[PDB]
């Protein structure tokens, strides 16, 4: 995500938050992480992938 710093640092922020939260809050953080991974993949998709 070197060409999309905002997205990269959001991913990092969420991973860090995941390690500090619990229960249902952690599920919501993991939901956010999954959304970011989906958005990252489509922003970085090369032809042939």
Binding residue for a second copy, selected from 45, 46, 47, 48, defined by CB under 8 A: 45
| Other beta carbons less than 10 A from residue 8's beta carbon | 14
Distance, CA of 24 to CA of 4 (rounded, Å): 29
Say whether residue 2 binds a second copy (CB under 8 A): yes
Of 6 and 48, CB closest to a second copy = 6
Distance, CA of 47 to CA of 13 (rounded, Å): 29
Shortest distance, position 48 Cβ to a second copy, whole Å:
14
Say whether residue 49 binds a second copy (CB under 8 A): no
């Amino acid at each position: 995500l070197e060409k999309h710093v905002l997205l990269k640092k959001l991913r990092d922020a969420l991973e860090s938050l995941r390690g500090r939260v619990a229960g249902r809050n952690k599920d919501d953080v993991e939901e956010a992480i999954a959304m970011v991974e989906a958005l990252a993949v489509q922003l970085t998709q090369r032809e042939g992938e």
